[PDB]
Structure formats: structure tokens, C-alpha cells
Write an enzyme that holds these catalytic residues in place. Structure first.
Site, PDB file in Angstrom:
ATOM      1  N   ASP A  59      -8.432 -25.018  32.750  1.00 33.23           N
ATOM      2  CA  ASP A  59      -7.665 -25.738  31.745  1.00 33.23           C
ATOM      3  C   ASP A  59      -7.694 -27.225  32.064  1.00 33.23           C
ATOM      4  O   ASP A  59      -7.484 -27.622  33.214  1.00 33.23           O
ATOM      5  CB  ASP A  59      -6.228 -25.218  31.685  1.00 33.23           C
ATOM      6  CG  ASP A  59      -5.577 -25.464  30.339  1.00 33.23           C
ATOM      7  OD1 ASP A  59      -6.152 -26.219  29.527  1.00 33.23           O
ATOM      8  OD2 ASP A  59      -4.493 -24.896  30.088  1.00 33.23           O
ATOM      9  N   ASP A  88      -5.833 -29.711  30.419  1.00 30.10           N
ATOM     10  CA  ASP A  88      -4.656 -30.491  30.074  1.00 30.10           C
ATOM     11  C   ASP A  88      -3.855 -30.820  31.334  1.00 30.10           C
ATOM     12  O   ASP A  88      -4.056 -30.246  32.407  1.00 30.10           O
ATOM     13  CB  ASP A  88      -3.793 -29.727  29.069  1.00 30.10           C
ATOM     14  CG  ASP A  88      -2.676 -30.577  28.487  1.00 30.10           C
ATOM     15  OD1 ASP A  88      -2.487 -31.720  28.951  1.00 30.10           O
ATOM     16  OD2 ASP A  88      -1.987 -30.102  27.559  1.00 30.10           O
ATOM     17  N   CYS A  91      -3.578 -34.823  -6.116  1.00 28.67           N
ATOM     18  CA  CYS A  91      -2.817 -35.481  -7.172  1.00 28.67           C
ATOM     19  C   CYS A  91      -1.329 -35.514  -6.854  1.00 28.67           C
ATOM     20  O   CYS A  91      -0.639 -36.476  -7.211  1.00 28.67           O
ATOM     21  CB  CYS A  91      -3.052 -34.781  -8.510  1.00 28.67           C
ATOM     22  SG  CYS A  91      -3.817 -33.151  -8.382  1.00 28.67           S
TER      23      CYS A  91
HETATM   24  N1  LIG Z   1     -10.356 -25.728  24.353  1.00 29.37           N
HETATM   25  C1  LIG Z   1      -9.509 -25.508  25.364  1.00 29.37           C
HETATM   26  N2  LIG Z   1     -10.018 -25.331  26.602  1.00 29.37           N
HETATM   27  C2  LIG Z   1      -9.178 -25.108  27.617  1.00 29.37           C
HETATM   28  N3  LIG Z   1      -7.846 -25.030  27.598  1.00 29.37           N
HETATM   29  C3  LIG Z   1      -7.370 -25.208  26.363  1.00 29.37           C
HETATM   30  C4  LIG Z   1      -8.110 -25.448  25.217  1.00 29.37           C
HETATM   31  N4  LIG Z   1      -7.278 -25.582  24.115  1.00 29.37           N
HETATM   32  C5  LIG Z   1      -6.076 -25.424  24.613  1.00 29.37           C
HETATM   33  N5  LIG Z   1      -6.056 -25.197  25.965  1.00 29.37           N
HETATM   34  C6  LIG Z   1      -4.887 -24.982  26.809  1.00 29.37           C
HETATM   35  O1  LIG Z   1      -4.090 -24.017  26.167  1.00 29.37           O
HETATM   36  C7  LIG Z   1      -2.710 -24.203  26.553  1.00 29.37           C
HETATM   37  C8  LIG Z   1      -1.897 -24.230  25.287  1.00 29.37           C
HETATM   38  O2  LIG Z   1      -0.530 -23.912  25.623  1.00 29.37           O
HETATM   39  P1  LIG Z   1       0.677 -24.715  25.000  1.00 29.37           P
HETATM   40  O3  LIG Z   1       0.408 -24.915  23.511  1.00 29.37           O
HETATM   41  O4  LIG Z   1       1.966 -24.069  25.321  1.00 29.37           O
HETATM   42  O5  LIG Z   1       0.555 -26.137  25.693  1.00 29.37           O
HETATM   43  P2  LIG Z   1       0.473 -27.654  25.221  1.00 29.37           P
HETATM   44  O6  LIG Z   1      -0.519 -27.717  24.065  1.00 29.37           O
HETATM   45  O7  LIG Z   1       0.212 -28.567  26.349  1.00 29.37           O
HETATM   46  O8  LIG Z   1       1.913 -27.881  24.605  1.00 29.37           O
HETATM   47  P3  LIG Z   1       2.600 -28.211  23.203  1.00 29.37           P
HETATM   48  O9  LIG Z   1       2.146 -27.078  22.281  1.00 29.37           O
HETATM   49  O10 LIG Z   1       4.103 -28.081  23.470  1.00 29.37           O
HETATM   50  O11 LIG Z   1       2.193 -29.563  22.728  1.00 29.37           O
HETATM   51  C9  LIG Z   1      -2.666 -25.561  27.262  1.00 29.37           C
HETATM   52  O12 LIG Z   1      -2.760 -25.262  28.648  1.00 29.37           O
HETATM   53  C10 LIG Z   1      -3.990 -26.208  26.853  1.00 29.37           C
HETATM   54  O13 LIG Z   1      -4.441 -26.942  27.983  1.00 29.37           O
HETATM   55 MG   LIG Z   2      -0.257 -30.537  26.267  1.00 32.64          MG
END
Ligand SMILES: Nc1ncnc2c1ncn2[C@@H]1O[C@H](COP(=O)(O)OP(=O)(O)OP(=O)(O)O)[C@@H](O)[C@H]1O
Ligand SMILES: [Mg+2]
Ligand SMILES: [Mg+2]
Lengths: 985, 75, 147
Positions: free
Chosen positions: A450, A452, A580
Site C-alpha cells: 500500500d 498511502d 443543462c
Molecule cells: N491502487 C491502489 N493500490 C494500493 N493501495 C490502494 C490503492 N487504492 C487504494 N489503496 C489503499 O486502500 C485503502 C483504502 O482504505 P480507506 O478508504 O479506509 O483509506 P483512505 O482512502 O486513506 O481514507 P479515506 O477514505 O477516509 O479518505 C488505503 O490504504 C489506500 O492506500
Molecule cells: Mg488516505
């Protein structure tokens, strides 16, 4: 004083009033085993006033089967004392305490009481006092694969919201004198018989605009009835109806009274005779425990099972239960009486936490009253389960070996899983795997990826992260936490920071995917989910999809050669309003929010991108002149943002903001009203400004108004940020500058060769040469909802409110504007726990290698109404190809890297099919209608060379296969679908 | 008399009608010839949409008039 | 995705629209350049209008992005070439086909809808002074749709 920086996602589910009422309620938790600690964690994350624990029993090894705050050095110490220290760190606003002894009167200090791992007599004693004092009482029990929940909130429970949905509102076409209310054309109100609604802005029937709710008699999908409106008027035209939600009264019964005549809740209608069995079974379990000093039946023991069955018979006779006991089910309950699974514990903990939230907030419809659940389909069948194999080994996995045995434990210890994402669902899945001992063997391994980083708002539902860890990668922190929880997983976990997509195929390639055992998704977007699904289909690996939305959740399992994929069914769409409506005639606040977002993008993002690209690309103007849809607009933007309106101070930014306010809120409205006057009529004679179209009114700039000043400040700040100036927030300077502003005159215009290219050239050459400006870049404004110091949501809210004031629409605050504009998905910790539990219950099915499709269950649930449902997965469709049975999804063609002509000949001679279209990726390699010269030039080339030539990019060294989509016609020309081709490089 | 109805695909259908014929009858003939349900037929003449319940004479339809058959779309 | 795109393309090839021709750009299936012929019984008679169609990665789950390229003087078509139709915004079921999209577009060109316009000024001119609208439409379709 709600900390909106922490409860941002939860407040979209509960609300401000709900949390305000929840922050004044105390919760006591009796029993600190796995279920108790899970409930305590969920409650602490929820945000209750305080939490008290009571469990003075010394720690034992088997207790670690579902406890993640206990270590092997804590054997012999009371669980509460060693658990409070680690529980206190989850939330800083929720104090947690411990009580050594429990007295009845002390129970009056708490608002809710949760009871686990307690004898039936003590539960009755507690309930007889907690019922007559109007205290919510929730009793939970988890025995192996069985679970029981009992709720009692008093005899006068008041439920303000019974479903958690927003009130239904809609527009009205006409109302007759007989109370027949009619919607607009092809408009369905969605009301049900018995609902209450109120009417406003009804023309011709002012009486219905009073606001008094009235009964609803549904007469059709588009019309309903309210009764008699003879006195109020004859016929009413136009108006809006809005649903009114009324409080409901729910009356419970005490535990002692409900034991004789309970009220079950059935989670599935395929097995309706079981809950009566469980009701007797759990009482018999308590009686047997009382008859053996609290000792549950030994695992897979015949004598204890027989004695327990005798107790069941005695109780069934005693209570006059007219139900035939199922001996097999009862003996299975007896065998798994000492079981302690983390999946069932998590599931029941999530459920009980949601019930506690319902009790505290007086919201949503609660359980009424008993809830008996079982997942007996998860029992392994490929291993020998007996008393000898299921006996404890004096290890922390005894609670699970006592159900599944040592052989299945070893099978789990050698798993090689792949978890996508490390969010809340990822954290729960990792916790469950750590508790179960997944990949603790020699050949085991776990990979989590991940990209993020941890944010403040993610700490509300992700318990593996602490405030000191804000700003770091999720995978590393989660891996460290779960290695601390289970020391045996040191070196068995690999944490990546790569986004799973088309660009990460160099790392997660064939070598990586050939050693996995299953893939579990924790994503939040559809594109990545469908890409992972495609990858799993290609590699034929089991997939576990899980999704949540507020209090709703669903889990799906995809098994190779057995069930269809997850991308094959894409139900949930989105909504994009007609242009529209947004552009000219809005009628809701969502329209204004979307318009404000588009305005923000067009004012602070696109022009800056054009300016930056102009100073980078040496041939930008020529490319734009023949590529961009509106070269004139791009040239005007570049000129305005470079020379015409380049600010030299913040005062010029304020003046520009005022000018834009005038342009967008005072002039366009005048133009629209000049084109469509308020007295204009349509082609059919009806008034133009009627129904969905609301007559606008121009706005006059008033500095003393709060919204105008907020818009000015936000626009000036964003412009200064774009031009890198020093912004100020003191109103004195704003009031000083805006006093000396002369509004340019404006009068609406009625209108009435090839020089356009000459004019565009004249505009273009006016721009300074790129060589003159070297190193001068403008900063684009990238939208970021989570940051409250960039004036983004402030600007959007200001613009939306001003446009609402234009059309006399109800303005919305910053909270709802942030919810709508930012596309924030509501999330909850309880829903995450439940989906994790369901996925981990499917995981043990997957490990056992079950073959039938009826033994798997895709699950759906809605915690607002206590709804749970489980259905068999849809089998992958079959087809007849060349008189053979072909699976539509899980079958492919494996071919070498032969030439295109050889591939065509193979398909013509082997399958007897004529190839008509062949594509790969986003390119059309071969088609039947292409000019013969092109085909003759492309035919004698290999597939790899053809793809390299068409895509104008060499194949990377790590690439080892190609996926080709082929559409072919039969001898008679009838199109027949065929599975894709897996070319092996 | 005779009239011509032009469809969305460029086809021209010739019909034998009378000035007194109702719009319902014309929609019925078009349903019988092309199989298009009346509910989906939008007949236009001289910039005005033909409505059920009326006659051709109400719209001043005369010898060899031209109508347009389009689909019911609004927005 | 690709399969549905090619099925629709083959259906277009086998069944001649006779007034339109949509084709991919180069060898990319997510970018088409379609052509529409001005209706005979309209001020836009004898005109050729080019449209750009960008298929989303989620097709047919999401509507394609269809934008006019040739400048046209229509009440329901703005300057940027954007089109005003429900089947592209929220009436996009998975049952629709570019085939029908084009049918729709043509039917729109056949008869405008000034009661719910996209260009208020052109709608007002059309409602008030029909002759001026006819002249402007003819001039635009001669300047842009011809040559
Ligand atoms: N393409 C991707 N590749 C890897 N990890 C991903 C991808 N898309 C989303 N994630 C991970 O999926 C998880 C989504 O969980 P969650 O929505 O609870 O977290 P967030 O997006 O950080 O939070 P929020 O929805 O409150 O803004 C996050 O860890 C994000 O890093
Ligand atoms: Mg996030
Ligand atoms: Mg997210």
C-alpha cells in the site's frame, strides 16, 4: 466541541447530535476474553464517555487464542490489569478504568452493561436489576462456530430513527381534491403505506403548506393518497413533499420472562428450525458448566456430549418446548463448546458494539431480541477431526486447535497470502491472520502492499496506528504492530509501498504470483479492484472482495473454475447530473456544489496548467491550435494570467476576486433573465419559471454580509497562493480596499470571414516569448479536502451558498459541502470488523479446499436495521464451443509466440472458427475490415513483434506473457464468443 | 389524401389519410407498418408536435404534407 | 470492454447507417472519430459534423464522452462541442449502443428542444425570430459543416 478532525468519517454516519448524546454515556464490560476485548476496542474507538473493565481471573495460555493484548509473559496476571494499559492508548478522549469487585448498586453508574463469559444465573441476577432501572443490557456468548446475542433496553425504549435513511422528498405535479397526490412524469416517490409527509410550496392549495404531517396511502409507483382535502381547496399545482420521521416506542422483556417465550431474529430463512435449538443448547451449556465447576465439555468427547444431550433433553422437557431436538447439531455444539475462534469473536464484537451504539444514541432499529448465529459450514472436511487431534498442546493456538485440529493448524501455518491495501479492513485482516497463526510455519509468508500514508482521520478506525505514527506508510507500521503482537511472524512479512496497477507489473509479476495462495482486497476504488480481479483470473487464485458503505457491508468470494469473477457483475453506478441543470437551472444544493467544484477547477487549476505547459513545450501553441477544443479560450487564459491580470500585491488579488464575484453572481443572472424573463412562457403556454426551474435574482455585493466576505477572502487567498503572494486575513484591509472599487457598467446584449484565425494569431503573438520567461512557474491549486488551511472547502462552500442564494435554495454548511464535494465514503469500525470476520470465515473454507459451490456464502448485511443475509455464489456461466463445454471466465488458450498467420490457421483448423478481431491491451492488432496492404504487411510478423510495432514501445524484460482478446465468427458467419488467449513469450 | 412521413433513418413512408383522421389513427398506421409502439412515436409537422386526441385538420395538414417521426426524448 | 466495443463496431459495419460513420482513431479502440450528415429537412442540410468519442475504461458501465468538433449553431449545443442528452449523463444503462447514441443525436438535430435549452440566447432567438435562427444556422453550416 466535537473533534471534527478525528470523527470526520463517523459523523457522516451518526451525526453531531448522535455523538453529542453518545459522549455522555458510560459503558461497563464484564468479561475480558477475546470477545470482550474486541467489544472494548470498538467502543473506545466509537467515542463513548468512558469504559470500565471487570475480569479478575488470571491469564492462561489458551486465552491468547483470541486476545491480542496478552503476551506469554502475562500468564497468571488478571486480564483487566494487563489489558487496560494497552487499551488506554487507543483513544485519548475516552478514559478506561478497572474494577476489582462488582456490586449491584455500582451498576447504576453506567448507561450500558455488556456481559460475556458469565453463567446464566449471574446474568439473570444482573438483568433483574438492570431491567427495572432502565439500563441497556447486552449479553454475548461465543462457543466455537456458534454465537448468541441478547439485548434488553427496557420497557420504554425510544427509537428516533428506525432505518437510518434520509427522509424521502420529491416534487409534485398535481394534487386533486380527493387527496390524490401525483408526482411528476416518470417520478416515483418511494413511500410506503403508513408514512407521514408534509407539503410546501404548493400552488392552489395553501392549506397543505402548513406543515402538518398526513397519512400516506400508496396507490401506485407515481401517485399516492392522503385522504380528503375538500376544505383546503379544489386542485393544487406544483410543490414539494418531504417525509417526516417520527419516534417509535419499543418495549422489551426481562431476561427471566424472555427465557420462557423468547423472540428470535432469523438471519437466514433456509434454516428456520435452528434458533429454537440454539435457545435450548446454550441454556444446557450453562447448566453443564454449572454441573462441572464451570468446565465446558471437552473437545470431541463422547461422554461429555452424551451428558450434555441429556441436559438438553431435560431442559426441553422442562420448558415445554414443542420442538424436536436435532441430535447431530446438539452434539456438534457440545464438541465445539471449548472452541475460541477470532473470526466469530470479531463478528460478534462488531455486532455488539453496533448494538451498544444504538442503545446509547437511541438511533437505528435494534435487535429484538435474541440473535443466534452459526457458521457450521466452515468446519474442515479434508482433515481428521477427533478427540486425539483436537486436544490442546499447551500453545496459544489451543482455542482453535480444539475446533479444527493440529493438521489444519499446520496447513494454515504454511499459507502464502497476498493482501492488497492496508486500510482498516487490511488491519483487521492482518490481526485475524496473526491470531490464527497464518504463515507462522517454515514455508509461510505474507505480503502487504500500500502506497498511502497515515493521516489523522484514519486513526479513528485503524487501531494498528497511533498518533505518533501520523505521516508514515501504512504497510510498515502495520507489519511492525502485527510482528509485535505475534513474535513468530518476525521476518515472515514483506511490506511494499507500491500502488497495485498497470505500472507495478514489474514487481508483482509471474514469479511473485506463482507462489501465492489467495488474494484479499482492501481497496476503495473500482478500477484497482477490477485490475486485481483480472490478475487473479489470469493466475487462477482465490479472491476475497469486501466492501463497506456506512452501516452496510458485503463480502464476496471468487474461486477458480467454480464461481464467476467480481468484475463480471458491476451493480453500483454513480450519478452525473444533466449539464443543462448544472449550467443554467439548478434546483438542489448538490447542483450548486458541483457547479462550485467546476468553477474552482476552471479558475485555479486549468489556466495554471495551460500557462505551465506553454512555458515548457516549445511547440505548445501550434499543438493546441489544432488539438484543443477551444484554442481561443486557452489563449485568453494564458494572456489574462500572464500579462493582462498579473497581480503585484494582495490588493490586486482582492480586486480580482471582487471582479469575479461580480462576473459570476451579478452579470450572468442578468443575462439569463434578459434571455428568459420572469414572465416568459414555454411553447405549450405554461410559465417558463415553474416546476424544476426556479426564477433567479442577481446578487448585490454587500461587504457586511458574512458569505460575501468569506467568498472574497477565499478567492483572494487562492489567487495569492497561485501567484505565490503573501495573504492576509484581517478584515480591515479588505474593507479598506473594497471601498474604492468602481463596478464596471454592464447591460445585457441582444446580439443581432476567416479573420478569426487572424485574431487568434494576434492574441498569440502578444504573449511574451518563452525564452523571455525562464524559471517563472505558477503554482496550480490541487484539491485537498482533508487540509483545512488551504481555503478549498471554504471557497467551495461559499460559492455553493451564493449560488443557492441566487435560486432561493436552502444553503448548506461546510460539513455537508465537504461530505459531498470531497466524495467522502462513510465508514465505521463495526462494519469493518464484521466484514473482516466474514472474510476470515470464508478463508477457512478456502484453506480446506471445498469443492461444492453451496458451501460458500457471499454475505450482505445492514447494521442500521440488523439485517444479515447469505447466498450461494453465482456459478460461472458455461458455453458450447466446437461441441465442447467451455467455461466463459476461467478458460483460456495457451499458445506459443507464433506468427499471426499461424495463429489464424490454428484457429481455423483446430477450432473450426474464422478469426475476425484480435486485440491486446488498448490496441487493435487485427481486424477483418482493415485494408489488405496493412494486413499483408502485418501477417508474417510474430505477435510480440506486432505488439511492439503497433504500441511503439519495446516489451519489457520482465514481461513473459500476452493476453489477447479474440472475437471470431463461425462458418455461417454467426458470432460466437471464445475465451481469451494466453500467449507465452 | 396522401402524406409522407420521414423516419430517423432517412426512410420515407407514404400514407393514404384524410384531413379528418385522428392522430391516434396515424400512430396506429405507423405501428402497423413499422412496428413502433405509439408511446414512442413523436410526430412533428411544421414545427408542432402532433398530440393524441386531435385530428389532422387541427394542424392544417393538407395534400402531400410531410411529417417527422422521432423518438420521445426530452432534456 | 474491448469485446463489446468490437461487437458494436462490427454491427455498425454490417448494418450501414447510411448517414453516419464512426471509426476508431488509428488503432486505438478508446478514441473514435465519428461523422454525422446534416438532415435534409433542417437548416443544417448538406453538412458534415465530426464528433470525438472517448470510451471510458469502465465501458459500458459508464457513458462514452461524445463531443462535437465542427462548430454548429444549435440551441442545445454550446461552443465547446458539448452535447445535451440524458443518455450520456444518468440514463446510461449498459443496454445503450453508440449506434443509438448517433440515432438520438440525429433526431435532436432534426428538432431542437428550446424549452430546456443549453444556450439561452440561441433558444430565445429561435423562439422569437424563427427567420433569424434559420439564417444563422444556414450560415454556420455553410461556414463550418461545408469544406
Ligand atoms: N491502487 C491502489 N493500490 C494500493 N493501495 C490502494 C490503492 N487504492 C487504494 N489503496 C489503499 O486502500 C485503502 C483504502 O482504505 P480507506 O478508504 O479506509 O483509506 P483512505 O482512502 O486513506 O481514507 P479515506 O477514505 O477516509 O479518505 C488505503 O490504504 C489506500 O492506500
Ligand atoms: Mg488516505
Ligand atoms: Mg478511501
Amino acid at each position: 466541541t466535537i473533534d471534527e478532525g478525528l470523527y470526520s468519517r463517523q459523523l457522516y454516519v451518526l451525526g453531531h447530535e448522535a455523538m453529542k448524546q453518545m459522549s455522555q454515556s458510560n459503558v461497563l464490560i464484564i468479561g475480558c476474553k477475546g470477545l470482550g476485548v474486541e467489544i472494548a476496542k470498538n467502543v473506545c474507538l466509537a467515542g463513548v464517555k468512558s469504559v470500565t473493565l471487570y475480569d479478575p481471573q488470571p491469564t492462561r495460555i489458551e486465552d491468547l487464542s483470541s486476545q491480542y493484548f496478552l503476551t506469554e509473559d502475562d500468564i497468571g496476571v488478571p486480564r483487566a490489569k494487563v489489558t487496560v494499559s494497552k487499551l488506554a492508548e487507543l483513544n485519548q478522549y475516552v478514559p478506561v478504568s478497572v474494577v476489582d469487585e462488582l456490586s449491584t448498586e455500582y451498576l447504576k453508574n453506567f448507561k450500558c452493561v455488556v456481559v460475556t463469559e458469565t453463567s446464566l444465573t449471574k446474568q439473570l441476577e444482573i438483568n433483574d436489576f438492570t431491567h427495572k432501572n432502565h439500563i441497556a443490557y447486552i449479553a454475548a456468548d461465543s462457543r466455537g462456530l456458534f454465537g448468541s446475542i441478547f439485548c434488553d433496553f427496557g420497557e420504554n425504549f425510544i427509537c428516533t430513527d428506525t432505518d437510518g435513511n434520509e427522509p424521502l422528498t420529491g416534487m409534485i405535479a398535481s394534487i386533486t381534491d380527493d387527496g390524490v397526490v401525483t408526482m411528476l412524469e416518470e417520478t416515483r416517490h418511494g413511500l410506503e403505506n403508513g408514512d407521514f409527509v408534509k407539503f410546501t410550496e404548493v400552488k392552489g392549495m395553501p392549506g397543505l403548506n402548513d406543515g402538518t404531517p398526513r397519512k400516506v396511502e400508496v396507490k401506485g409507483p407515481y401517485t399516492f393518497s392522503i385522504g380528503s382535502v375538500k376544505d383546503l381547496g379544489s386542485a393544487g399545482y406544483n410543490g414539494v413533499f418531504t417525509q417526516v420521521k417520527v419516534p417509535t416506542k419499543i418495549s422489551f422483556k426481562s431476561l427471566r420472562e424472555s427465557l420462557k417465550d423468547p423472540e428470535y431474529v432469523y438471519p437466514d430463512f433456509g434454516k428456520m428450525m435452528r434458533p429454537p435449538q440454539y435457545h435450548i443448547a446454550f441454556q444446557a451449556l450453562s447448566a453443564f458448566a454449572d454441573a462441572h465447576e464451570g468446565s465446558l465439555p471437552r473437545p470431541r468427547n463422547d461422554i461429555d456430549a452424551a451428558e450434555f444431550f441429556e441436559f438438553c433433553k431435560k431442559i426441553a422437557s422442562t420448558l415445554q418446548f414443542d420442538v424436536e431436538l436435532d441430535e447431530k447439531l446438539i452434539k456438534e455444539i457440545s464438541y465445539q463448546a471449548r472452541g475460541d475462534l477470532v473470526a466469530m469473536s470479531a463478528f460478534l464484537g462488531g455486532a455488539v458494539a453496533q448494538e451498544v451504539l444504538k442503545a446509547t444514541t437511541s438511533k437505528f432499529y435494534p435487535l429484538k431480541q435474541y440473535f443466534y448465529f452459526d457458521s457450521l459450514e466452515s468446519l474442515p472436511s479434508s482433515v481428521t477431526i477427533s478427540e486425539e487431534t483436537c486436544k490442546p498442546r499447551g500453545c496459544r493456538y489451543d482455542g482453535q486447535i480444539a475446533v479444527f485440529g493440529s493438521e489444519f493448524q499446520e496447513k494454515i501455518a504454511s499459507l502464502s497470502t497476498f493482501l492488497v491495501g492496508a486500510g482498516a479492513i487490511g488491519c483487521e485482516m492482518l490481526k485475524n491472520w496473526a491470531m490464527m497463526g497464518v504463515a507462522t510455519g517454515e514455508s509461510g509468508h505474507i505480503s502487504v502492499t500500500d502506497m498511502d500514508s497515515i493521516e489523522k482521520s484514519n486513526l479513528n478506525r485503524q487501531f494498528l496506528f497511533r498518533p505518533r505514527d501520523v505521516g508514515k506508510l501504512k504497510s510498515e507500521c502495520a507489519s511492525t504492530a502485527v510482528s509485535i503482537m505475534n513474535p513468530s511472524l518476525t521476518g515472515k512479512i514483506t511490506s511494499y509501498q507500491e500502488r497495485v496497477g498497470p505500472e507495478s507489473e514489474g514487481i508483482f509479476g509471474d514469479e511473485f504470483f506463482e507462489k501465492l495462495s489467495l488474494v484479499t482486497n482492501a481497496l476503495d476504488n473500482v478500477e484497482a479492484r477490477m485490475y486485481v480481479d483480472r490478475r487473479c483470473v489470469f493466475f487462477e487464485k482465490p479472491l476475497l472482495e469486501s466492501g463497506t458503505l456506512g452501516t452496510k457491508g458485503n463480502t464476496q468470494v471468487v474461486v477458480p473454475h467454480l464461481t464467476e469473477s467480481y468484475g463480471s457483475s458491476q451493480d453500483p453506478p454513480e450519478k452525473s447530473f444533466p449539464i443543462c441543470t448544472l449550467k443554467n437551472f439548478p434546483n438542489r444544493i448538490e447542483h450548486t456544489i458541483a457547479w462550485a467544484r467546476d468553477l474552482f477547477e476552471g479558475l485555479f487549476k486549468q489556466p495554471i496548467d495551460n500557462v505551465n505547459m506553454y512555458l515548457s513545450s516549445p511547440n505548445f501553441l501550434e499543438t493546441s491550435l489544432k488539438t484543443s477544443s477551444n484554442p481561443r479560450e486557452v489563449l485568453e487564459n494564458i494572456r489574462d494570467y500572464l500579462v493582462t491580470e498579473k497581480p503585484l500585491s494582495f490588493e490586486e488579488c482582492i480586486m480580482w476576486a471582487r471582479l469575479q464575484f461580480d462576473k459570476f453572481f451579478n452579470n450572468n443572472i442578468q443575462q439569463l433573465l434578459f434571455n428568459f424573463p420572469k414572465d416568459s412562457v414555454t411553447s405549450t403556454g405554461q410559465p417558463f419559471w415553474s416546476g424544476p426551474k426556479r426564477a433567479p435574482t442577481p446578487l448585490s455585493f454587500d461587504i457586511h454580509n458574512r458569505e460575501h466576505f468569506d467568498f472574497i477572502v477565499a478567492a483572494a487567498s487562492l489567487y495569492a497562493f497561485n501567484y505565490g503572494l503573501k495573504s492576509e486575513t484581517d478584515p480591515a484591509i479588505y474593507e479598506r480596499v473594497l471601498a474604492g472599487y468602481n463596478p464596471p457598467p454592464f447591460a445585457p446584449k441582444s446580439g443581432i470571414a476567416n479573420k478569426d484565425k487572424q485574431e487568434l494569431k494576434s492574441i498569440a503573438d502578444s504573449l511574451p516569448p518563452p525564452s523571455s520567461l525562464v524559471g517563472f512557474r505558477l503554482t496550480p491549486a490541487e484539491f485537498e479536502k482533508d487540509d483545512d488551511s488551504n481555503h478549498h472547502i471554504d471557497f467551495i462552500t461559499a460559492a455553493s451558498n451564493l449560488r443557492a442564494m441566487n435560486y432561493d435554495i436552502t444553503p448548506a454548511d461546510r460539513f455537508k459541502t465537504k461530505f459531498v464535494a470531497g466524495k467522502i465514503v462513510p465508514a465505521m469500525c463495526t462494519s469493518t470488523a464484521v466484514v473482516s470476520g466474514l472474510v476470515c470465515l470464508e478463508l477457512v473454507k478456502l484453506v480446506d479446499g471445498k469443492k461444492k459451490i453451496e458451501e460458500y456464502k457471499n454475505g450482505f448485511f445492514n447494521l442500521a436495521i440488523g439485517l444479515f443475509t447469505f447466498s450461494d455464489p453465482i456459478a460461472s456461466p458455461k458455453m458450447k464451443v466446437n461441441g465442447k463445454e467451455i467455461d466463459k471466465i476461467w478458460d483460456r488458450y495457451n499458445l506459443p509466440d507464433c506468427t499471426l498467420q499461424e495463429l489464424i490457421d490454428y484457429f481455423q483448423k483446430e477450432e473450426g472458427l474464422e478469426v475476425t478481431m484480435l486485440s491486446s491491451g488498448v490496441s487493435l492488432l487485427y481486424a477483418n475490415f482493415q485494408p489488405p496492404k496493412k494486413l499483408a504487411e502485418r501477417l508474417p510478423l510474430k505477435i510480440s513483434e506486432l505488439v511492439e510495432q503497433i504500441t511503439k514501445k519495446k516489451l519489457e524484460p520482465f514481461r513473459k506473457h500476452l493476453v489477447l482478446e479474440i472475437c471470431c465468427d463461425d462458418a455461417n458467419g454467426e458470432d460466437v464468443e471464445v475465451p481469451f488467449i494466453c500467449i507465452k513469450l | 389524401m396522401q402524406i409522407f412521413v420521414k423516419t430517423l433513418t432517412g426512410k420515407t413512408i407514404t400514407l393514404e389519410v384524410e384531413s379528418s383522421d385522428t392522430i391516434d389513427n396515424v400512430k396506429s398506421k405507423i405501428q402497423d407498418k413499422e412496428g413502433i409502439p405509439p408511446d414512442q412515436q413523436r410526430l412533428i409537422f411544421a414545427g408542432k408536435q402532433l398530440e393524441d386526441g386531435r385530428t389532422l385538420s387541427d394542424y392544417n395538414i393538407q395534400k402531400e404534407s410531410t411529417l417527422h417521426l422521432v423518438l420521445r426524448l426530452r432534456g | 470492454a474491448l469485446k463489446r466495443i468490437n461487437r458494436e463496431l462490427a454491427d455498425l459495419g454490417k448494418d450501414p447507417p447510411s448517414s453516419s460513420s464512426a471509426g476508431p482513431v488509428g488503432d486505438d479502440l478508446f478514441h473514435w472519430q465519428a461523422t454525422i450528415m446534416g438532415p435534409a429537412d433542417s437548416p443544417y442540410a448538406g453538412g458534415v459534423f465530426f464528433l470525438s468519442i472517448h470510451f471510458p475504461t469502465d465501458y459500458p458501465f459508464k457513458p462514452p464522452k461524445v463531443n462535437f468538433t465542427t462548430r454548429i449553431y444549435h440551441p442545445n449545443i454550446n461552443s465547446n462541442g458539448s452535447i445535451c442528452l440524458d443518455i450520456l449523463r444518468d440514463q446510461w444503462s449498459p443496454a445503450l449502443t453508440i449506434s443509438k447514441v448517433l440515432l438520438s443525436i440525429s433526431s435532436l438535430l432534426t428538432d431542437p428542444n428550446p424549452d430546456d435549452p443549453l444556450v439561452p440566447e440561441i433558444a430565445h432567438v429561435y423562439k422569437t425570430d424563427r427567420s433569424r435562427y434559420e439564417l444563422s444556422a444556414r450560415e454556420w453550416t455553410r461556414k463550418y459543416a461545408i469544406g
